[PDB]
Design a protein around this ligand. Structure first.
Ligand SMILES: Nc1nc2c(ncn2[C@@H]2O[C@H](COP(=O)(O)OP(=O)(O)OP(=O)(O)O)[C@@H](O)[C@H]2O)c(=O)[nH]1
Ligand SMILES: Nc1ncnc2c1ncn2[C@@H]1O[C@H](COP(=O)(O)OP(=O)(O)CP(=O)(O)O)[C@@H](O)[C@H]1O
Ligand SMILES: Nc1nc2c(ncn2[C@@H]2O[C@H](COP(=O)(O)OP(=O)(O)O)[C@@H](O)[C@H]2O)c(=O)[nH]1
Ligand SMILES: [Ca+2]
Ligand SMILES: [Ca+2]
Ligand SMILES: [Ca+2]
Ligand SMILES: [Mg+2]
Ligand SMILES: [Mg+2]
Ligand SMILES: [Mg+2]
Lengths: 54, 423, 339, 437
């Protein structure tokens, strides 16, 4: 039961009590994935308009 | 400002659409001339979803009235709220469609569809952010069925990223005008399978049985049938018209209700249905709302399984007791809810009740039992088509027998798709 | 109308409990994967405790205590008794045991040499939880070779109490039900699973008293009592005629003491008092009695079977005090009171 | 002094953020018009409250906050609310139509069209900072914007602010108040793509907040207003060390250092006590021992789970009110001899304790009673993986039938992202089991 690193100030205090010792993707790659998804949306809509044209 | 454009086509579509606007105009305090005379700011909060605001604080319904005959739309213009509609939004011909899907879809209707799309375009161009469209029509006739589905196809071509919603009245030999209604309905159902996101299946068989068996009307009229439809249409659109968190727009409703794109055909239900001053408790509302006798599709839900359910309660009631009764129905009959869609029942409460009721409950179910409706239509179709009976009315308009065969196969495929998820 | 699910088809106890719940007309059985249940008769292995108590408007109850395996495993029980101050290594009703794969090899041989030099009886027994594999010997070098799963080696009770006529070994099974309020209910009916062969202190038939071993390796099965099962009425009558004492005085007081000690020890770790779901569980305690009428705890079973003559009484009692106490409809137990 | 920027995404993030900044103003004595009488350095300063508030020459204290929603009705509440004067219009970003409870719609379709605008408005706040610490990001798991756009924003923030720390306050979905059947999908899709971009995430299960409001506040049917007032108290407990003088959790980096030894396991469990109804005219004030003991009751956790069947990696106690270190250690010594508190072998069995003498502030007219002392425990338990187990199971049920999947593919998302996100949750669920058993 050890209390260590006690720091006191006007608005409170802090300390530590020990009970027992122990035993990213780039901007380009993000734009590619966003543009790939938009292209798949464009392809699905183009197929829909083709189907409606038939 | 999430606007909806309303379209009503044909005799049934315009008579049911006219009553719908009469009902919700009253709920929002809009008088027959477009002036607001309400007493609650909840009425005007989401008023722009269905109404345009004109000069002089007038509210104009965002509604487009379509028919190939002038007769029924003249009766609308002469009706109670006939003067509230935008006069330029009356689009009609003179030939009619003779209860013929081919005339509505291919010959008579094609001549008129462009002037309808011109009006749709004018309404859309003045929308801050258009959600989509709702269409009221029957499937058994010619204009609403044939031209209505042609309209839906051309609307999807011009607004491919907007939601399409329909109230579709299904024919029944009990309440029938002509023998060709199964032909017209079968041709239309495939259009709806492809080109709508949400379809409320309103079965004239169910509406008749409810008027006769429950409401004790030995001789129901079309007006009596339309009273049930008006009350159902007001209930299912409450989440769109009033402030709320659940299914507040058409797209969120579709995301909550449609797990597979083709299975978007809903059984609507309403409670109470009284033949009248007695107060209805929350347990009574919940039991009746789920009762098959309160369903508008004439399908037994115990014959299938619920994919998703939307429940809406209207009036001043205990929301805690609402949750208790809703959880009570699910926990006492959990075999009728598919286990592979957790928490598929969603409940919404609105404080403003319908006219003449302290409280009410509206049911919207995506059940696999709806296949009984399509099986019914498929049998009546096949009974005539196997002998090519009455086909000359359609081949005379340019159609081929192969198109009927493909419509037959498409609806039997739809029935089979419901059957695979029931198991 | 309450709802329940069944997830252990091989449980004879809860197959009878489920049968009784249906016979009341107020309980409905759902599919095994339906989450909208009031009661789960769960599986023995990997019960999804983390998915319980998250269904709105459903009071959910399960027939197993999460964490009770610490009491119902060979190595876990030995570790729990040694390391818990409530039980301590000075525990007098549990045989001196050691865990052999931390590991206790050098500690086991430490006291083993103290018995060989001191002329005392130095017979031990090795066992584990992966058995039907048990070895009994007086040489520690032979016990460790049989192990080469985790095994435990404890002191074999060389001086057991022997029933006469027969000069035969036995063991006592007690059924204990702990409800959702952590009330400890001891079933008034126990069973003695007796060996049918005479105890030879110089073959494992007369040393292991299991009901499956006496029916497959013993030639005197069913001779003295039906199925090598003596119930409390006959056993108490024997103690009065032979030893001039009762079952309650000589044995049952120690049994109730041991049951309370084990279950109160793990109560803080497994209690569902302030939990979002509730638990109960039926336990099977196995005891040994030596010639001095001293009771020793052997093991605790977490999924026990019952005696055929007692299935009806006990299972109904499970429904009464464990299930209907939480879900009321429209004593055979001895309540071991505690704090 | 180093500044922190708060970002609120979707309805849940915005309304919770609105509740937090209301509480911050009451705690720091900032009036709704932005004026702060106790602040004597007009138009500048590097006090502890300046980490969250900038200052104009007129003396207004402006939150370092950005509000983002794909629908204007929720942020318009901020524009016409009580604290409308705090924010300038550049901080409130709205779109026309929302993400319709669809991760793919918020991440790909709509997110692509609004991400540059959000980053630009964030750049405006970062340009006011002399030493930006990083970001606190408030959002829901289940909403299309809160799940989909947040994960895109967290990716770009890692690109544009690589050295800055990012903390999350995430609303875990609960069907008792949820508005969508596909929320398990969105929760797992957004956790997968955000996992490598968040340094420390505080999950709040709406089920736990709901039941705490019913049980302790006697609210029969709690509303979002009830839930958010309670959530803003927990959030304030967590961020108080950044806004007041102190030595524990004084910068965002210290949250990771004190609570997250393994970077993937960065979901500390929060437990708060006491929660007392304001309708009680006189309630007996709980002691340090009693509120500290309540930190180990499942009924007070932000996520319902059983820490007894797990292991601790770290544990912070954040006290506010009349608390001295003597009573804290006496309470801890008693709790050690009663509770099942197992730490992992490669971590010290201890408690980092922080005490702020100012007792908790409650919103006047609210449901929470003023108390003399309160505590929030931040413990990193493997037991919080139970929430991942529940979520992953519901995902497995729907995805086995591909239910609702077409809504996501229809927005340009590939079906493989579902399984890829699920396999990540499987690895995460396996990491907890290796650490905790
Ligand atoms: N605690 C709390 N939860 C909320 C609040 N608002 C919404 N939620 C939860 O958030 C989830 C829905 O996500 P939202 O934040 O509403 O949706 P969104 O982020 O705006 O994204 P959209 O789909 O575009 O509307 C549900 O689980 C709600 O229970 C709130 O104010 N407080
Ligand atoms: N220390 C000891 N001294 C004497 N006999 C012992 C003993 N340990 C075990 N036994 C004997 O071994 C037999 C079986 O022991 P154990 O309980 O490990 O088997 P088991 O667990 O497979 C039976 P159950 O099916 O009830 O769990 C007991 O009947 C007991 O008589
Ligand atoms: N519920 C209801 N059904 C109607 C009404 N009018 C016609 N129907 C049904 O609609 C079908 C006839 O279609 P109809 O609308 O009259 O043809 P259209 O004018 O060419 O579209 C038949 O099944 C009728 O039973 C009505 O006012 N209410
Ligand atoms: Ca012509
Ligand atoms: Ca200053
Ligand atoms: Ca990083
Ligand atoms: Mg007609
Ligand atoms: Mg055993
Ligand atoms: Mg939203």
């Amino acid at each position: 039961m050890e209390v260590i690193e006690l720091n006191k100030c006007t608005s409170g205090q802090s300390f530590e009590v020990i009970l027992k010792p122990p035993s990213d993707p780039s901007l380009e790659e993000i734009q590619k994935k966003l543009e790939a998804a938009e292209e798949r949306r464009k392809y699905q809509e183009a197929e829909l308009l083709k189907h409606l044209a038939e | 400002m999430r606007e909806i454009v309303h379209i009503q086509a044909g005799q049934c579509g315009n008579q049911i659409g006219a009553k719908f606007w009469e009902v919700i105009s009253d709920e929002h305090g809009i008088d027959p001339t477009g002036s607001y005379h309400g007493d609650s700011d909840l009425q005007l909060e989401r008023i722009n979803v269905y109404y345009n605001e004109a000069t002089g604080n007038k509210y104009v319904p965002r509604a487009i009235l379509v028919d190939l005959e002038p007769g029924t739309m003249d009766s609308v213009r002469s009706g109670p709220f006939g003067q509230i509609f935008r006069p330029d939004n009356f689009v009609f011909g003179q030939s009619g469609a003779g209860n013929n899907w081919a005339k509505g879809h291919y010959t008579e209707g094609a001549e008129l569809v462009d002037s309808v799309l011109d009006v749709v375009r004018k309404e859309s161009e003045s929308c801050d952010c258009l959600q989509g469209f709702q269409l009221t029509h029957s499937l058994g006739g010619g204009t609403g069925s044939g031209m209505g589905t042609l309209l839906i196809s051309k609307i999807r071509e011009e607004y491919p990223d907007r939601i399409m919603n329909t109230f579709s009245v299904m024919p029944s030999p009990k309440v029938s005008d002509t023998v060709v209604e199964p032909y017209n309905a079968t041709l239309s159902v495939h259009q709806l399978v492809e080109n709508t996101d949400e379809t409320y299946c309103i079965d004239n068989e169910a509406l008749y049985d409810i008027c006769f068996r429950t409401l004790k009307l030995t001789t129901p009229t079309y007006g009596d049938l339309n009273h049930l439809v008006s009350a159902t249409m007001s209930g299912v659109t409450t989440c769109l018209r009033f402030p709320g968190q659940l299914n507040a727009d058409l797209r969120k409703l579709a995301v909550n209700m449609v797990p597979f794109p083709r299975l978007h055909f809903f059984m609507p239900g309403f409670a109470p249905l009284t033949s009248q001053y007695r107060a209805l408790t929350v347990p009574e509302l919940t039991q009746q709302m789920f009762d098959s006798k309160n369903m508008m599709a004439a399908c037994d839900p115990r014959h299938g399984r619920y994919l998703t359910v939307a429940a809406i309660f209207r009036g001043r009631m205990s929301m805690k007791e609402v949750d208790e009764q809703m959880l009570n129905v699910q926990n006492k009959n959990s075999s009728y809810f598919v286990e592979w869609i957790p928490n598929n029942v969603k409940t919404a409460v609105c404080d403003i009740p319908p006219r003449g009721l302290k409280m009410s409950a509206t049911f919207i179910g995506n059940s696999t039992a709806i296949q009984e409706l399509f099986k019914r239509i498929s049998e009546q179709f096949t009974a005539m088509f196997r002998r090519k009976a009455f086909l000359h009315w359609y081949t005379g308009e340019g159609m081929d027998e192969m198109e009927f065969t493909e419509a037959e196969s498409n609806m039997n495929d739809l029935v089979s798709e419901y059957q695979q998820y029931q198991d | 109308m309450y709802t329940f699910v069944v997830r252990d088809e091989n449980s004879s106890v809860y197959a009878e409990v489920s049968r009784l719940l249906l016979a009341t007309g107020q309980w409905k059985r759902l599919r095994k994967d339906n989450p909208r249940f009031n009661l789960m008769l769960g599986e023995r292995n990997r019960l999804p405790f983390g998915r319980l108590g998250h269904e709105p408007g459903l009071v959910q109850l399960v027939n197993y205590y999460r964490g009770a395996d610490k009491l119902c495993r060979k190595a876990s029980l030995v570790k729990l008794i040694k390391t818990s101050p409530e039980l301590s290594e000075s525990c007098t009703w549990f045989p001196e045991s050691y865990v052999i794969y931390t590991d206790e090899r050098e500690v086991f041989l430490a006291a083993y040499n103290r018995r060989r030099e001191g002329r005392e009886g130095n017979v031990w027994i090795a066992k584990s939880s992966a058995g039907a594999g048990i070895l009994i010997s007086s040489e520690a070098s032979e016990l460790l070779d049989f192990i080469d799963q985790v095994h435990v080696i404890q002191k074999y009770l060389e001086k057991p109490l022997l029933l006469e006529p027969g000069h035969r070994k036995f063991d006592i099974r007690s059924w204990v039900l702990v409800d959702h309020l952590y009330n400890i209910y001891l079933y008034r009916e126990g069973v003695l699973r007796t060996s049918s062969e005479p105890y030879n202190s110089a073959d494992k038939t007369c040393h292991l008293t299991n009901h499956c071993i006496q029916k497959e390796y013993s030639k005197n099965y069913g001779r003295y009592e039906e199925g090598n099962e003596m119930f409390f009425e006959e056993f108490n009558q024997y103690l009065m005629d032979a030893l001039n004492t009762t079952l309650e005085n000589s044995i049952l007081l120690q049994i109730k003491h041991i049951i309370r000690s084990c279950l109160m020890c793990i109560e803080p770790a497994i209690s569902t008092k302030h939990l979002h779901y509730q638990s109960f569980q039926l336990f099977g305690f196995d005891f040994m009695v030596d010639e001095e009428l001293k009771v020793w705890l052997i093991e605790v079973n977490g999924a026990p079977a019952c005696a055929q003559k007692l299935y009806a009484e006990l299972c109904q009692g499970i429904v009464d005090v464990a299930i209907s106490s939480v879900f009321p409809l429209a004593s055979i137990f001895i309540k071991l009171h505690h704090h | 002094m180093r500044e922190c920027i708060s970002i609120h995404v979707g309805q849940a993030g915005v309304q919770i953020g609105n509740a937090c900044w209301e509480l911050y103003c009451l705690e720091h004595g900032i009036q709704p018009d932005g004026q702060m009488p106790s602040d004597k350095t007009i138009g500048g300063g590097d006090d502890s409250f300046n980490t969250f508030f900038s200052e104009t020459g007129a003396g207004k204290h402006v939150p370092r906050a950005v509000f983002v929603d794909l629908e204007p009705t929720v942020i318009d509440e901020v524009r016409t609310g009580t604290y409308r004067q705090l924010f300038h219009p550049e901080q409130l970003i709205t779109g026309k139509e929302d993400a319709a409870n669809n991760y793919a719609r918020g991440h790909y379709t709509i997110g692509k069209e609004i991400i540059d605008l959000v980053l630009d408005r964030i750049r405006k706040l970062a340009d006011q900072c002399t030493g930006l610490q990083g970001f606190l990001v408030f959002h829901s798991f289940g909403g299309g914007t809160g799940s989909g756009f947040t994960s895109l924003l967290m990716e770009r923030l890692s690109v544009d602010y690589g050295k800055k720390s990012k903390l999350e306050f995430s609303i875990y979905p609960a069907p008792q108040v949820s508005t969508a059947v596909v929320e398990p999908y969105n929760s797992i899709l957004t956790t997968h793509t955000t996992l490598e971009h968040s340094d420390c995430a505080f999950m709040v299960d709406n089920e736990a907040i709901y039941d705490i409001c019913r049980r302790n506040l006697d609210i029969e049917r709690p509303t979002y207003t009830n839930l958010n007032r309670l959530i803003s108290q927990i959030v304030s407990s967590i961020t108080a060390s950044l806004r007041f003088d102190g030595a524990l959790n004084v910068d965002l980096t210290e949250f990771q250092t004190n609570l997250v030894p393994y970077p993937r396991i960065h979901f500390p469990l929060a437990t708060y006590a006491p929660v007392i109804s304001a309708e009680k005219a006189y309630h007996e004030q709980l002691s340090v021992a009693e509120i500290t003991n309540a930190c180990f009751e499942p009924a007070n956790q932000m996520v319902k789970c059983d820490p007894r069947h797990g292991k601790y990696m770290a544990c912070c106690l954040l006290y506010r009110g009349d608390v001295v270190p003597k009573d804290v250690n006496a309470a801890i010594a008693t709790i050690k001899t009663k509770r099942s508190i197992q730490f992992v072998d490669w971590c010290p069995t201890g408690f980092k304790v922080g005490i702020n003498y100012q007792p908790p502030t409650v919103v006047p007219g609210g449901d929470l009673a003023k108390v003399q002392r309160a505590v929030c425990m931040l413990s990193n338990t493997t037991a919080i993986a139970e929430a991942w187990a529940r979520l992953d199971h519901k995902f497995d049920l729907m995805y086995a039938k591909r239910a609702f999947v077409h809504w996501y593919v229809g927005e340009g998302m590939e079906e493989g992202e579902f399984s890829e996100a699920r396999e990540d949750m499987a690895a995460l669920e396996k990491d907890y089991e290796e650490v905790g058993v």
